[PDB]
Design a protein around this motif. Structure first.
Motif, short mmCIF file in Angstrom:
data_model
loop_
_atom_site.label_atom_id
_atom_site.label_comp_id
_atom_site.label_asym_id
_atom_site.label_seq_id
_atom_site.Cartn_x
_atom_site.Cartn_y
_atom_site.Cartn_z
N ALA A 142 -39.26 46.14 18.97
CA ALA A 142 -39.12 46.97 20.18
C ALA A 142 -37.72 46.87 20.85
O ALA A 142 -37.08 47.89 21.16
CB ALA A 142 -40.22 46.62 21.21
N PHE A 143 -37.25 45.64 21.04
CA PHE A 143 -35.93 45.36 21.62
C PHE A 143 -34.81 45.89 20.70
O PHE A 143 -33.80 46.40 21.18
CB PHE A 143 -35.82 43.83 21.85
N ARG A 144 -35.01 45.79 19.39
CA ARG A 144 -34.07 46.34 18.44
C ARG A 144 -33.81 47.84 18.74
O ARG A 144 -32.65 48.27 18.86
CB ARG A 144 -34.56 46.09 16.99
N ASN A 145 -34.88 48.64 18.90
CA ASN A 145 -34.74 50.06 19.28
C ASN A 145 -33.82 50.19 20.49
O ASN A 145 -32.76 50.85 20.43
CB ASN A 145 -36.11 50.70 19.58
N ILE A 196 -25.15 29.80 32.13
CA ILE A 196 -26.50 29.31 32.39
C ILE A 196 -27.36 30.04 31.42
O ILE A 196 -27.28 31.25 31.35
CB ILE A 196 -26.91 29.64 33.82
N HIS A 197 -28.19 29.37 30.64
CA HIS A 197 -28.90 30.10 29.57
C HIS A 197 -30.23 29.44 29.25
O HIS A 197 -30.34 28.24 29.36
CB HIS A 197 -28.05 30.09 28.33
N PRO A 198 -31.25 30.23 28.86
CA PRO A 198 -32.52 29.59 28.48
C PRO A 198 -32.47 29.06 27.09
O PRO A 198 -31.82 29.66 26.26
CB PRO A 198 -33.53 30.73 28.56
N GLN A 199 -33.17 27.97 26.82
CA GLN A 199 -33.14 27.36 25.48
C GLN A 199 -34.15 27.98 24.55
O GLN A 199 -33.95 27.92 23.34
CB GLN A 199 -33.21 25.83 25.55
N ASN A 200 -35.15 28.66 25.12
CA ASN A 200 -36.28 29.17 24.35
C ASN A 200 -36.83 30.54 24.79
O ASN A 200 -38.04 30.72 24.90
CB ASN A 200 -37.41 28.13 24.37
N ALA A 201 -35.95 31.51 25.05
CA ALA A 201 -36.41 32.87 25.29
C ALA A 201 -36.08 33.70 24.03
O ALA A 201 -34.96 33.62 23.50
CB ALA A 201 -35.77 33.44 26.54
N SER A 202 -37.05 34.44 23.51
CA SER A 202 -36.86 35.22 22.27
C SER A 202 -35.95 36.45 22.46
O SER A 202 -35.30 36.86 21.53
CB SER A 202 -38.20 35.64 21.69
N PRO A 242 -31.52 34.94 23.20
CA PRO A 242 -31.63 33.87 22.24
C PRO A 242 -30.47 32.90 22.38
O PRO A 242 -29.38 33.30 22.78
CB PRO A 242 -31.57 34.63 20.90
N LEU A 243 -30.72 31.64 22.03
CA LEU A 243 -29.73 30.58 22.19
C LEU A 243 -28.66 30.55 21.10
O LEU A 243 -27.54 30.12 21.38
CB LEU A 243 -30.42 29.23 22.22
N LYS A 244 -28.99 30.99 19.88
CA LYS A 244 -28.06 30.81 18.78
C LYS A 244 -26.72 31.46 19.09
O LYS A 244 -25.69 30.90 18.76
CB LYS A 244 -28.63 31.23 17.41
N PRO A 245 -26.72 32.64 19.73
CA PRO A 245 -25.44 33.27 20.04
C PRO A 245 -24.60 32.51 21.02
O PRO A 245 -23.38 32.43 20.86
CB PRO A 245 -25.86 34.61 20.65
N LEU A 246 -25.26 31.95 22.02
CA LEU A 246 -24.56 31.18 23.03
C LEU A 246 -23.87 29.96 22.41
O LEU A 246 -22.73 29.66 22.72
CB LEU A 246 -25.50 30.76 24.16
N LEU A 247 -24.58 29.29 21.51
CA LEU A 247 -24.00 28.14 20.82
C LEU A 247 -22.69 28.52 20.18
O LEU A 247 -21.72 27.80 20.28
CB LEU A 247 -24.95 27.59 19.74
#
Ligand code: CL
Lengths: 576, 576
Positions: free
Chosen positions: A478-481, A513-519, A522-527
């Motif tokens: 859905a978010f991809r769209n 400031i970022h959440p560690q576990n929101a789908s 996402p965290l991987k980009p922030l890292l």
């Protein structure tokens, strides 16, 4: 030196104030009001300057009563924090005693009206959404084709609103005795409110790509036509939204409509003075009008009209309340001659000119209005003026302004945000400029610090978008769209307008400031962004927190996501 | 629900309490004390009753006076916390009036002593360390030193001092006030810790060894050393491992403050004098009585009269906060190999017994948990945690043998020691829940415990932690790389197998990472990778990355950055 404990104390008071909402009039002329504090909810009777608590343990909400009914129907979560709900009846003469309605299987209660003899609500179950009526016993009046919500009942006729596809809210009707369903659309746009005339037509608010109006719908032959009102203050107000409308026991139509971040109250089309801000429903109580009221300087409260004097209001200390020194709406000239409607909250703890934060709203399809905002108030309390620009993409100003963002992220909207920063400085409000935002606002902070270094002294980027390209591959269907629409569907646009690819041009301190576990954030980009900042000599701070959650209601929420931003800005303010 | 603002308020009081230190007797028999509050320093005369502030704007420290001088030499940062100092004279008869000692170019002032006629000091310029003298005749370099050096005492023309002149120990040096020169003596047994000059013009020094410490006399003419016999034997029976300080009082008697097992003891001519349990600073004779400074895990640094222990000067803490820090003791914990781990405990007046307990691990690793005031321990006790502080092998303060057991066994024996203390906490009936928290080598210990020993602790706080030894070498400077190869025996198998990044899979408990963004000896790149591993492996954590973490916690800002996240996190886990 920053006054850390004074900031924490003030933020706590701002989080903790009672906020009130008005629901109706029950029993022998008493207001049914709901009270919130840190998102804990309770239901109260108000009459003769006293309140009585109806429920015991906190609830989720209450179903709308018809005027005069002698009970209230509480809605409460079955398990802890889940989407499932139970219904509980409370007799208004026996406050505090709750009877569970065992005939309702636990489910997601979406809406409900209680006629005093039948409780009609919509719920969602594992498999379906339905319109129920309970009294007889339970009964399915209609299966709905989507989430839907009950607007009003009169006699047998039931009127409501539904997300039944097409990209717009449809009006529906049922019958109390014969059930069944009938759906009405509007090509122009969306139905936003509905109430039933004594003559058994459905009066509805229709929002459009430009301006809102009142239509009359004959439920039996499907015909629609516009409702002309005896007084014309309402058509002359030129509203863009219709919050709520309803017929009062005397027969008159009360309407609350909106334009430019504020709302106005009409009775049979005649304007009635109300305190400046935003309003909820209107009720007739002891022969006079009552409504709820909020604004950038006023937590939600219950006031009388037309004096605007409060009946119930939360308490703030006077210094703290003085720190929020007044808010105006201003129209900022942007790069292409378009005017960006922008709310400003001036701080009683800053000089003019003085420290200012451009606080960029999320979404992007959302709206900064003259409504209570914890972040804005906390910044004001910490000695920052606050500038809140409705950049193109925002809602509240027509469909055309909302659509300009499509295919131009980190383009036109950013110039708008920038134009507001500049206006801050040139009008002589701002001495120093900071930027701060969450969601799409975080993205804007990141874009500003990369595409426009030298504009802002520092920035706070929370729950920010980092790389559009990456964010797709690690996203749900859905978010991809959403991402492809917003980016026109091109790799050159997703790559060039992601600020991870422009990290080299940063010259100012950043706070992440970022959440560690929101789908969806996402965290991987922030890292990876932090890796790029480190590897390229850029100075920053970061706070990564689990269960960031959606909104801020409790002090814990503030400590996780609001205090880092305020402390960082206060610290930068002494680096001048 | 956590009491955030009460915690912030307590912590601020703990950071803000005046912490005293005793410098000498000046004037007409008034005490010279320096006061620390929020890393602001000031100098004061105390003479019974009220204090008088000698300086104006804050200072860095004062040079040590001889009994009775009528002036004080202030040392102050000339720039914004560069290590660039100017010296300022204040006549004791006229406090608040500063005259700058203009003959001295700004430089890093390492130490000094003022005879009343000469001011004798060491300092460090762009290129060198020197010993200077300043009299009515101008400024003179008496001697340029082979490393960092510190003046200890003057008497007549004889100057004694101490210096890091190589050989991995501290050497004794002397000069002449009139003819300069330099003399340097050292011991194959260990390091000199303190010096004073006897009536007969011999240097009495304290010598610390691989085991026990002793008093020696040095004839600065033959270089000849021998043991000093004192007339009472209390001092030798006390079997000290360290000598903090010694001095000759105006009557010719020798005062010595010596340490054993995390606590110290006052001696006059060999004879022990009663003193409040904890640790003590210099000792003087004021208006005919003994006075010294005092600190413990439950008392911020203060001035006390001996032998009653009545306080002369001491900072106010409020009563509730005062009672929350309920007393410390020392306990010997039996570890995996039968070795006894000396362990300080600070109990909380806001915890039941058994109750929440944090094993707070010291950094270094070559450092020591003693009965001395500790802002972290005090904050934890204030927030409702008992605190256990174990002197794991590698610690200093218990002989050279115990310090060396860590060499070639990181995340080995020392961890079992830390683990042993946890277990003792539960088994003795102190702890109901166990947490681990540490910075520097303590962060590493938290990371090791949560990977090598899951199920032991309920959560952990790892600040400034070591993450991967292998990687930390390749991104480290020459001097620190040496340190890493010694500590790890010089093997890749040891550097790889004892880095907790390689064991992230075994984590079953919540972790809080606090880390600097820009410290070259606690580098960020590794932490970023550790987070990657935790995300990629399903593990829940929070993280706070802050620029300029710095070395210690002195200001409220430092606490907000690096202490409050820990305390808040632990308080939250205590409810979940
Ligand atoms: Cl109340």
């Amino acid at each position: 030196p920053v006054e850390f404990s004074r900031i924490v104390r003030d933020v706590e008071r701002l989080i903790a104030v009672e906020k009130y909402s008005l629901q109706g009039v029950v029993d022998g002329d008493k207001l049914l009001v709901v009270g919130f504090s840190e998102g804990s909810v309770n239901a109260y009777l108000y009459d003769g300057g006293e309140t009585v608590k109806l429920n015991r343990e906190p609830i989720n909400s209450v179903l709308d009563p018809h005027y005069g009914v002698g009970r209230v129907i509480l809605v409460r979560d079955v398990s802890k924090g889940a989407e499932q709900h139970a219904l509980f009846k409370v007799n208004t003469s026996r406050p505090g005693e709750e009877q569970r309605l065992e005939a309702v299987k636990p489910m997601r209660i979406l809406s409900g009206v209680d006629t005093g003899e039948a409780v009609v609500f919509t719920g969602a179950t594992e498999d379906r959404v339905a319109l129920y009526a309970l009294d007889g016993g339970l009964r399915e009046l209609a299966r709905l084709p989507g989430f839907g919500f009950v607007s009003d009942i009169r006699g047998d006729l039931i009127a409501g609103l539904g997300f039944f596809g097409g990209g717009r809210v449809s009006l529906f009707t049922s019958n109390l005795s014969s059930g069944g369903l009938r759906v009405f659309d509007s090509g122009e746009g969306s139905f936003s409110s509905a109430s039933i005339s004594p003559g058994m037509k459905v009066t509805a608010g229709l929002e459009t790509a430009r301006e809102a109006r009142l239509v009359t719908v004959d439920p039996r032959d499907g015909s629609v036509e516009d409702l002309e009102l005896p007084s014309k203050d309402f058509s002359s107000y030129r509203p863009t939204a219709i919050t709520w409308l309803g017929y009062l026991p005397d027969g008159r139509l009360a309407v609350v409509a909106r334009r430019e971040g504020r709302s106005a109250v009409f009775i049979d089309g005649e304007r009635v003075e109300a305190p400046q801000g935003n309003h909820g429903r209107v009720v007739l109580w002891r022969g006079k009008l009552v409504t709820s009221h909020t604004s950038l300087s006023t937590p939600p409260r219950i006031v009388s009209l037309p004096s605007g004097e409060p009946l119930l209001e939360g308490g703030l200390p006077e210094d703290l309340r003085r720190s929020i020194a007044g808010s105006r709406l201003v129209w900022v000239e942007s790069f292409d001659g378009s005017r960006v409607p922008t709310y400003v909250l001036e701080s009683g703890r800053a000089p003019t000119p003085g420290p200012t934060v451009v606080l960029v709203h999320g979404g992007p399809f959302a709206e900064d209005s003259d409504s209570w905002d914890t972040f804005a108030a906390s910044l004001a309390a910490a000695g920052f003026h606050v500038v809140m620009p409705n950049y193109r993409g925002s809602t509240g100003y027509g469909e055309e302004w909302r659509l300009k963002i499509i295919g131009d992220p980190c383009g036109g909207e950013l110039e708008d945000v920038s134009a507001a920063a500049r206006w801050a400085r040139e009008s002589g409000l701002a001495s120093e400029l900071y930027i701060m935002g969450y969601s799409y606002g975080g993205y804007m902070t990141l874009c500003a610090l990369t595409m426009k270094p030298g504009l802002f002294k520092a920035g706070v980027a929370g729950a920010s978008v980092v790389d559009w390209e990456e964010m797709y591959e690690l996203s749900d269907a859905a978010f991809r769209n959403f991402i492809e629409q917003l980016t026109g569907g091109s790799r050159e646009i997703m790559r060039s307008r992601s600020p991870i690819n422009h990290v080299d041009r940063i010259k100012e301190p950043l706070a992440l400031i970022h959440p560690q576990n929101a789908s969806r954030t996402p965290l991987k980009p922030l890292l990876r962004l932090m890796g790029e900042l480190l590897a390229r000599g850029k100075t920053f701070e970061a706070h990564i927190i689990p269960d960031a959650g959606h909104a801020i209601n409790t002090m814990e929420d503030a400590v996780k996501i609001l205090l880092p931003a305020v402390f960082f800005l206060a610290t930068q303010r002494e680096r001048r």
